[PDB]
Amino acid sequence: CASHNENASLLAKKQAQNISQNLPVLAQSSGTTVKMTITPDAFLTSYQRQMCADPTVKLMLTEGINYSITINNQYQRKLDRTTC
Amino acid sequence: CASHNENASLLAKKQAQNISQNLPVLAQSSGTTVKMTITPDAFLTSYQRQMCADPTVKLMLTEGINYSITINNQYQRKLDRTTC
Amino acid sequence: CASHNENASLLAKKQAQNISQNLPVLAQSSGTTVKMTITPDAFLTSYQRQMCADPTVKLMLTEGINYSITINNQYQRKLDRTTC
Amino acid sequence: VAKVPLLGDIPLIGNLFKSTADKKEKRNLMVFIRPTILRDGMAADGVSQRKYNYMRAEQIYRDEQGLSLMPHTAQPVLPAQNQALPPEVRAFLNAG
Amino acid sequence: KYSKAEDLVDVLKQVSGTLTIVSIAASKHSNALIVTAPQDIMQSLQSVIEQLDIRRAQVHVEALIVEVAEGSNINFGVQWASKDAGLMQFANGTQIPIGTLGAAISQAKPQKGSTVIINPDTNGDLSTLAQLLSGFSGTAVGVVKGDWMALVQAVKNDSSSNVLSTPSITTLDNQEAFFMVGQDVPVLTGTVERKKVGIMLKVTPQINEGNAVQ
Amino acid sequence: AGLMQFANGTQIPIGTLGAAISQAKPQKGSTVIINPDTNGDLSTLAQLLSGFSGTAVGVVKGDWMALVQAVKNDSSSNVLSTPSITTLDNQEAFFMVGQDVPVLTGTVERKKVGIMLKVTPQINEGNAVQMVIEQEVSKVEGQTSLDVVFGERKLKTTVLANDGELIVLGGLMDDQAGESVAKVPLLGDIPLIGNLFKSTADKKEKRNLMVFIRPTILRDGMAADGVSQR
Amino acid sequence: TLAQLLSGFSGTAVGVVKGDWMALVQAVKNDSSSNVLSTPSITTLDNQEA
Amino acid sequence: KYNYMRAEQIYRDEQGLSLMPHTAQPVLPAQNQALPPEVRAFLNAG
Amino acid sequence: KYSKAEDLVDVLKQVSGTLTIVSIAASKHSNALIVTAPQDIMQSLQSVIEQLDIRRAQVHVEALIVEVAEGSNINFGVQWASKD
């Protein structure tokens, strides 16, 4: 009764939920977007591509729930299946 | 339901009310007139013009609630937007 | 049921509300106007432009809730999206 | 669930013969506590002054939108702190 | 300067007891204690009182009681009925059964009266039928024709809640505070004793000098 | 051919309405072995409407009906009460403005409810007052099976306040946001015509208490006449 | 009387009622489930009871 | 556990009370709010 | 620093009892105990109080109560009736 539908914004919270129970800084699941709070630039290309290489992110960013990042100076960017 | 009306004689009491809580002598709000009780002549021209210069008195004496003063010998006078 | 509407005067209070919990002086949210109480002139051009540079003020002064400032001598001025 | 039994298992028309009831429920409590230490005579007036100015800004916003049938009509607001001098008391200094 | 004179009065009666004659008395109205002792015991009891007279710190204790509840349920099922040729009935729910419905419909028919040794119609008594529907909630769709019927009932109840309450009290150190916002309600009990229900917070802090409240 | 009924509210259900309408029809009488009409008995229908509040719009034609109910209740309150007492140092004062009401209890004991303030100051010579205080605010709120219930909020603490300054004793801040819904299920999700099949009830609530206390020290014979004269 | 039988009855009853002789075939399958997880927690000092 | 309850009350808030928007709803104060935006500027002057 | 003054007061009355005159008293309001003894017993009771004043660790105890129930039943049977 009857069919997706799907997915989140629940699990998009549940996934930021999972992140924060181990922490450390916070992760905020805003709508379908995930957020993460805290000179890490080359951090990004490194840090992003493991996500981009992760088959769940390769599932989820290809599922359609958005991802984003924040860093403290301060800055951020969003990354999705396209930016990977 | 429906429209002024306005203003006092309440606040014309409430304004003499405000004066007296700090005191010192009394202030009596008689009808719409304020009263104040205690050789201060050149007191007046000085003392009056600050009121005459005060934008609330420049509001209120131009609102239409009367003002007056008393001094103890004894004397007084009334001052309104016109006498300012 | 059914659609803005929006915004404040609630949050225009809630935003002066936020300011004062850390304080210090007060902030008064008067209608849609914010107020702040205490030779800071070149204070202004400095102090104003960070607000004028703040993207929430660049949101809110462009949302339509007024802003204002007060300083104690005494003086003040109001600043909106235009004065920024 | 309840069903006929044998007919309730057809993958399409099964639902004509069944009666289902589902339920899901959730609850969360937490109780937290935050102490604060007021040592100075000035420390007691830092906390108790900001909760005052917080209630007095509820009663002003409650006042700014008045009693709708009776204007303007007052309504209680909590006295200000550091009222300084009323305007007419101000002038009495400038004479004597 | 700070201590309440008659709290120190017992603390000083033991200290003075085994330091031996000595008398300690406290004037309540004047908040002062009167030490009578020899010149040596006095100089001892002055350095104690000097060190017990210190200023106390006070604590502001906030509690935060959060609660987030979220319910759901869903109920869907079909029912049949017919002539002498059968019925199908399910007792789940909240889902009103078609047997006890098909009766309440028939007890609701108008009973044509006559009285002899008139042509009124007593009509119905819906007490029975309106008792089913009293608490019923959600769809019931039907076909009632020729006494056979098919009644498809479905509903989805969904609730939520959010609550945040935060009582707070201010005490001196080492003194216990009590804060109740509630109501005071009688319990049977036996003889009607009088019991208090509502938010209640009773706390008694002591500052541990690591700047930690305990 | 059916019904749709929702038990949320305060929202009077259409089943128990459609009965109370029909029990209200005039029953045509006759008596033999006359032509009066007993008309109705509206006891049943007027019991629904007793506490009902807010719109009910309908179409009642041919016994089928569609009844659209809606309301928005909105309240507010504001209260400021400020009892005050004057004592000597180290002496305890008691101030009650209230009423004295019997409690069952057992044997009828006699209980006092209302604003009550009982304080016993001592001046700490840093010019700081050191209260020992019991505030209480009670009132009789309605009954129970066997007695009266009293609304009651009290706090008894010990605070240390400067001579002319204001310390907060206590407080509460209480929010709620309820919600409810009911629907068919499958049809309640259409983004436009969904609302025909749903029944919603929302709620929001808020409360704030604070209790403050301001001591003042009257030392001179002239200090007692400064406060009590104004 | 008849609606008292059917009060708590659940599941099929199929019948043939003709000429007062009848054959009434009743069948049902009730199936339930449950799952519950509750997790209270308290914080104490050592050696003190909560 | 605080940031876990505060993420329940935000997700409860993101999908609002449906009949009354937008209307608030209680959420639990943040930790390390730092400085409000207007308090931020007051530093940059004095 | 940590202990509640009137918990140690009995612990110290036995220690002081058989170490013999000695008096131990505890001020509740000030959370301090007052030791009066000769110079020798004092130096003993200072090394006890120093070692009983330690900081306590606190524990967070979670319980998890799981329950999984699963019922079933099935009922099938034929019945006849007839005339005489």
Coordinates of N, CA and C in Angstrom, one line a residue, chain H:
Chain H
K1 N 23.9 12.6 23.8 CA 22.5 12.4 23.9 C 21.7 13.7 23.8
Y2 N 22.3 14.9 24.1 CA 21.7 16.1 23.8 C 21.5 16.4 22.3
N3 N 22.6 16.3 21.6 CA 22.5 16.5 20.2 C 21.7 15.4 19.5
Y4 N 21.4 14.3 20.2 CA 20.5 13.4 19.6 C 19.0 13.8 19.8
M5 N 18.7 14.3 20.9 CA 17.3 14.8 21.1 C 17.1 16.1 20.3
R6 N 18.1 16.9 20.1 CA 17.9 18.1 19.4 C 17.8 17.9 17.9
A7 N 18.3 16.7 17.5 CA 18.0 16.4 16.1 C 16.7 15.7 15.9
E8 N 16.1 15.2 16.9 CA 14.7 14.8 16.8 C 13.8 16.0 16.7
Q9 N 14.0 17.0 17.5 CA 13.2 18.2 17.5 C 13.4 19.1 16.3
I10 N 14.5 18.9 15.6 CA 14.6 19.7 14.4 C 13.9 18.9 13.2
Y11 N 14.0 17.6 13.2 CA 13.3 16.9 12.1 C 11.8 16.9 12.4
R12 N 11.4 17.0 13.6 CA 10.0 17.2 13.9 C 9.6 18.6 13.5
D13 N 10.5 19.5 13.5 CA 10.2 20.9 13.2 C 10.3 21.1 11.7
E14 N 11.2 20.5 11.0 CA 11.3 20.7 9.5 C 10.0 20.3 8.8
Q15 N 9.3 19.3 9.3 CA 8.0 19.0 8.8 C 7.1 19.5 9.9
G16 N 6.4 20.7 9.6 CA 5.9 21.5 10.6 C 4.5 21.0 11.0
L17 N 3.9 21.8 11.9 CA 2.5 21.6 12.1 C 1.8 22.0 10.8
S18 N 1.0 21.1 10.3 CA 0.6 21.2 8.9 C -0.5 22.2 8.7
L19 N -1.4 22.3 9.7 CA -2.5 23.3 9.5 C -1.9 24.7 9.7
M20 N -1.2 24.9 10.8 CA -0.6 26.2 11.1 C 0.8 26.2 10.6
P21 N 1.2 26.9 9.5 CA 2.6 27.2 9.3 C 2.7 28.7 9.8
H22 N 4.0 29.2 9.9 CA 5.1 28.3 10.0 C 5.2 27.9 11.4
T23 N 5.1 28.8 12.3 CA 4.8 28.6 13.7 C 5.8 27.7 14.4
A24 N 7.0 28.2 14.6 CA 7.8 27.9 15.8 C 8.0 26.4 15.9
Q25 N 7.4 25.9 17.0 CA 7.5 24.6 17.7 C 8.8 24.5 18.5
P26 N 8.8 23.8 19.7 CA 9.9 23.9 20.5 C 11.1 23.1 20.0
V27 N 12.3 23.7 20.0 CA 13.5 23.1 19.7 C 14.5 23.4 20.8
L28 N 15.4 22.6 21.0 CA 16.2 22.7 22.2 C 17.5 23.5 21.9
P29 N 17.9 24.4 22.7 CA 18.9 25.4 22.3 C 20.2 24.7 21.8
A30 N 20.9 25.4 20.9 CA 22.1 24.8 20.4 C 23.2 24.9 21.5
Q31 N 24.2 24.1 21.3 CA 25.5 24.3 22.1 C 26.5 24.9 21.2
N32 N 27.3 25.8 21.9 CA 28.3 26.6 21.2 C 27.7 27.5 20.1
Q33 N 26.6 28.2 20.5 CA 26.0 29.2 19.6 C 27.0 30.2 19.0
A34 N 28.1 30.4 19.7 CA 29.0 31.5 19.5 C 28.2 32.8 19.5
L35 N 28.5 33.8 18.7 CA 28.0 35.1 18.8 C 26.9 35.4 17.8
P36 N 25.8 35.9 18.2 CA 24.8 36.3 17.3 C 25.3 37.3 16.2
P37 N 24.7 37.4 15.0 CA 25.3 38.2 14.0 C 25.5 39.6 14.3
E38 N 24.5 40.2 15.0 CA 24.7 41.6 15.3 C 25.6 41.9 16.5
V39 N 25.7 40.9 17.4 CA 26.8 41.0 18.4 C 28.1 40.9 17.8
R40 N 28.2 40.2 16.7 CA 29.5 40.0 15.9 C 30.1 41.4 15.5
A41 N 29.2 42.2 15.0 CA 29.7 43.5 14.5 C 30.2 44.4 15.6
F42 N 29.5 44.4 16.8 CA 29.9 45.3 17.9 C 31.4 45.1 18.3
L43 N 31.9 43.9 18.1 CA 33.3 43.7 18.3 C 34.2 44.4 17.3
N44 N 33.7 44.4 16.0 CA 34.5 45.0 14.9 C 34.6 46.5 15.0
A45 N 33.8 47.1 15.8 CA 33.9 48.6 16.0 C 34.8 48.9 17.1
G46 N 34.3 48.7 18.4 CA 35.1 49.0 19.6 C 36.3 48.2 19.7

